[PDB]
Write a protein that binds this ligand. Structure first.
Ligand SMILES: Nc1ncnc2c1ncn2[C@@H]1O[C@H](COP(=O)(O)O)[C@@H](OP(=O)(O)O)[C@H]1O
Ligand SMILES: CC(C)NC[C@@H]1CCc2cc(CO)c([N+](=O)[O-])cc2N1
Length: 246
């Protein structure tokens, strides 16, 4: 197995649904942050080391390529942070892999990002996220890797992540740069709600008969998950309330 599809879209742009859609198309696993959080938390330190490598005056690109290849062994595709920030490196490693850019209205994205991925440092909800994440064993090292991977996608070192205006413009700039870098024939821009048709044509497959395009990972569902993790202090005791998600 080798990487066939590189998902360059940012978190909260429908990447979990695209993960599920690609697993339906190929019948093989697709990487996502959920893989890190719920299956392979040991990958957190590996990703951190690759992000740190990019900060060096002279980064070891072959160390990065091998780290990515090792991380993605057994996967047919990748989506979401932190992998999306490495889409250029992945394009080089997998010259035959096609690129997806999942995209959505920027104001809806920012709202979703603030409720799940990157709340403001003064937002009381941040403490609820953290208490719920402790049930999952997620600690401060995860937040550092996640934040660092987002800054790396935005190609900025010193950035005020609490400024909505700055995030909105980083969002647009990131999406614009993907379209500039990736050749058109190699890129599909998939807007939220687009469904199977464009995706399956791009990938040279038929539309899955009788199987609807996935619709998963809403911020309402993540808020409910946080509150149930805090209330019951166990993922196993609550997993039945979130069918088909993890
Ligand atoms: N088929 C679909 N149609 C419309 N929205 C979808 C969708 N699949 C996922 N989404 C939305 O995409 C966001 C999750 O993306 P990701 O998996 O990258 O984190 C959620 O937005 P909201 O948080 O606004 O509900 C989710 O509702
Ligand atoms: C339940 C909650 C309290 N924590 C678990 C959630 C699971 C979804 C999720 C997705 C991303 C990016 O897809 C990030 N991220 O980039 O940090 C964090 C989280 N966290």
């Amino acid at each position: 197995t080798t990487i066939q599809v590189i998902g360059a879209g940012l978190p909260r742009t429908g990447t979990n649904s695209m993960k599920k859609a690609l697993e339906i198309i190929y019948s093989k696993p697709c990487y996502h942050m959920y893989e890190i959080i719920f299956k392979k938390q040991s990958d957190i330190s590996i990703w951190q080391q690759l992000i740190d490598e990019t900060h060096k005056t002279t980064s070891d690109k072959r160390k990065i390529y091998n780290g990515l290849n090792e991380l993605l062994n057994g996967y047919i595709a990748t989506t979401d942070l932190p992998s999306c920030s490495f889409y250029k490196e992945l394009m080089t490693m997998y010259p035959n892999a096609k690129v997806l850019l999942t995209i959505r209205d920027k104001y809806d994205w920012l709202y979703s990002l603030r409720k799940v991925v990157l709340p403001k440092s003064t937002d009381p909800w941040k403490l609820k996220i953290e208490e719920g994440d402790q049930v999952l064993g997620i600690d401060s090292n995860f937040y550092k890797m996640s934040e660092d991977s987002l800054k790396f996608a935005f190609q900025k070192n010193h950035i005020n992540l609490d400024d909505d205006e700055i995030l909105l413009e980083c969002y647009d700039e990131y999406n614009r740069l993907v379209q500039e870098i990736v050749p058109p024939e190699r890129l599909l821009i998939h807007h939220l709600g687009d469904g199977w048709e464009s995706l399956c044509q791009f990938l040279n497959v038929d539309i899955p008969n009788g199987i609807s395009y996935p619709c998963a990972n809403s911020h309402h569902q993540m808020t409910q998950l946080t509150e149930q993790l805090i209330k019951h202090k166990s993922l196993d005791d609550i997993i039945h309330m979130f069918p088909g998600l993890i």
